[PDB]
Each structure stands twice: as C-alpha cells, then as structure tokens.
C-alpha cells in the first residue's frame, strides 16, 4: 500500500533524498529549436525548454516555435500540454496553439504578479467589453462570464478565428492561491479544483489536450498533471496499490524537463493521490466534503 510508503518516507525524512534521486534518473533530450537564437525571446527562462521530440508546433509558416510540450500518457489515456506563462510577445502564439490543438480548457496555476516578479502576461481579457485581438495570429478573445471563488476563478471565453469566423468556448481555470515553489493550502482545495476541471469536460478525449501552465510550465503544472494521471491509473488498473508515483513522474519527464520543482511538491503529490483514492475506491461522497473543506465560498 502506497499509504505505508508515505508514512515511511515521513518518519525516515528522506523526501529530498527521493526527490534528488528523480532529478538524477530523469530523461534528457535535445532542445535544438528552443535554443535557436531567433527563439531566444520566446522563452521566459533560459534553463527551461521543450524537448524537440514532444514540442508543440504552431501551424504558421514563419516560425513554428512555442515553449510548450505535449505530455502523452499512453496508459492513463490522457494528453496534457504544459507550457510557460505567455510572454508579452507570445500571447498570440498561446491562443494559436489552443486553437490548432483544439483545446477546450486552460488551467492557470500562477498569478500574473507573484512577489513583485512578473511571471506572466495578462493574456485573457478581464472585462467583457474590452476583448483582446491578437493580430499576428488573427484571433479574437472575449470574456463571457466568470465565477469567482475564495481561491480559484472559472472564466468562460469565446475564441474567434477571424480568418474563418468560426468560434469556440474556452474554459479558463485559474488557481490564485498556489505560491511559486509552494504547495496548495490542503489536499482538499487541490482536489476540489482538479475535480472541478474534470467535471467541466475539458479533460475529455473528444477535445484536444488541456493546456496547463504556471510560470515556467514545470513545477506547479507538474504537480497538477501527476495527481490527475495517478488518479486515472488507479481507476484504469482497478487497484490503488498499483501506481508508483515515482515511476509515473519519470514517465512524464520523458516529455518535458523539470516536472515537480521542490521536494515538498512531491510530498503533496503523494498526499493528494492518497486522499483522492478515497473517491476512486467508491466513496463517491468524499467529493462534497472536499468542496466543504476548501472554503470555496467567501
């Protein structure tokens, strides 16, 4: 049982030991396109880049590079796109990707401002009446509604393809209380958020991969996808003891470097998968307790 393994690591105290062990075992592939000089200004951080083999490609003829990776969990049967917080010049590429990849939801795990350091550009509209128009990529983006909550906000947006006039609804799930290099307040607030995303249908396979991003697209975004994927496998395999989080995290790291940034984020991942297993085991109604426990009203 994975519950045992956790209590061992805690008493033993070897979380950073386990952590550093995974950095050591993580894959490492070429990143040539990311390192081209013409692409210097399309990366927020110089030590964070997509592998050539899983990088998302813009369907534009000029320059097809965006700092985003397709994480295709074959067994779990779910694909994610992890990406950096858009830069002032890459907002148009962000929504071009969202359109071309047919995504229906975007999960944003950081805030535009975080401890005085700008970690993301304001790439979605905040007022219904001031919609954004990205001319380089020919897209229009309109806020349609929002549902503010004590620690997260769900927005509904209309993404229009000016070239064809076609339009699509995009769900924006913004988690506003997750500090960089930090962890959510509780497994409950986290799982309540995850399951909100799940219930929206954004994670369904009729849709393109959900886009997940934070500042760099590896640390908080990593924690989110690990938890969802482990919960998926426990359900698909039919046994909670089956899943080896370390083996799952290493699988994800074949697709984008650096997923999960602190030893405490790794611990929260065990914690959250352990809690979420209650739901997978059949205890349908623990979900309503998570909503209650998270104080999503205020």
């Amino acid at each position: 049982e994975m519950e045992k393994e956790f209590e061992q690591i805690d008493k033993s105290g070897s979380w950073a030991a386990i952590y550093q062990d995974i950095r050591h075992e993580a894959s490492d592939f070429p990143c040539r396109v990311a390192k081209l000089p013409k692409n210097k200004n399309r990366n927020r951080y110089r030590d964070v880049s997509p592998f050539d083999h899983s990088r998302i490609k813009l369907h534009q003829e000029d320059n097809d590079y965006i700092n985003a990776s397709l994480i295709k969990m074959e067994e779990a049967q779910r694909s994610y796109i992890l990406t950096q917080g858009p830069l002032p010049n890459t907002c148009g590429h962000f929504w071009e990707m969202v359109w071309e990849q047919k995504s229906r939801g975007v999960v944003m795990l950081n805030r535009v401002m975080e401890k005085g350091s700008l970690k993301c550009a304001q790439y979605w509209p905040q007022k219904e009446e001031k919609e954004m128009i990205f001319e380089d990529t020919n897209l229009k983006l309109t806020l349609i509604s929002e549902d503010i909550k004590s620690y997260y906000t769900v927005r509904q947006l209309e993404l229009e393809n000016l070239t064809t006039q076609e339009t699509r609804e995009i769900l924006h799930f913004h988690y506003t209380t997750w500090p960089a290099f930090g962890v959510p307040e509780s497994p409950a607030s986290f799982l309540n958020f995850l399951f909100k995303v799940r219930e929206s249908g954004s994670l369904s396979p009729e849709h393109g991969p959900v886009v997940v991003h934070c500042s760099a697209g590896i640390g908080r975004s990593g924690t989110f996808c690990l938890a969802d994927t482990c919960l998926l496998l426990m359900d698909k395999r039919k046994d909670p003891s089956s899943v080896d989080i370390k083996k799952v995290l290493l699988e994800m790291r074949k697709f984008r470097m650096g997923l999960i940034a602190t030893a405490d984020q790794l611990r929260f991942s065990y914690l959250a998968v352990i809690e979420g297993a209650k739901f997978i085991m059949g205890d349908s109604s623990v979900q309503d307790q998570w909503k209650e426990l998270s104080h999503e009203d205020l």
Partner: peptide, 7 residues
C-alpha cells in the same frame, strides 16, 4: 531572474 534556479 532569467534563470529558473535562482539565488
């Protein structure tokens, strides 16, 4: 900081 692992 331009570098993801900062001091």
């Amino acid at each position: 900081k331009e570098y993801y692992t900062v001091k």
